[PDB]
């Protein structure tokens, strides 16, 4: 998760990893992903297993 849109020691190489065929995330995307685990389907699922 690319910290901010400035120079994090981890950020400068994000571009480099992505060339492997992998994805990094903005915090807005990683937020989106985790707010999908509060939707009423995966809430209904969490309550089983």
């Amino acid at each position: 998760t690319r910290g901010t849109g400035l120079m994090s020691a981890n950020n400068i190489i994000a571009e480099g990893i992505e060339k492997m065929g992998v994805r990094t995330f903005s915090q807005k995307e990683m937020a989106f992903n985790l707010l999908g685990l509060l939707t009423p389907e995966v809430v209904e699922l969490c309550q089983k297993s």
Partner: protein, 48 residues
């Protein structure tokens, strides 16, 4: 915690371990006690 290898695990790492684990467990423990207290058995809390 950065630049803390296994020879350098001290108070900061022991204190971090409490924030990021034992007190997480104590905070989920707590909500179980306050929910049970009031016989709430059908309104669970998703821990993410």
């Amino acid at each position: 915690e950065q630049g803390i290898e296994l020879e350098h695990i001290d108070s900061k790492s022991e204190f971090a371990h409490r924030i990021m684990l034992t007190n997480i467990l104590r905070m989920m423990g707590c909500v179980k006690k306050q929910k049970s207290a009031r016989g709430i058995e059908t309104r669970p809390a998703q821990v993410i």
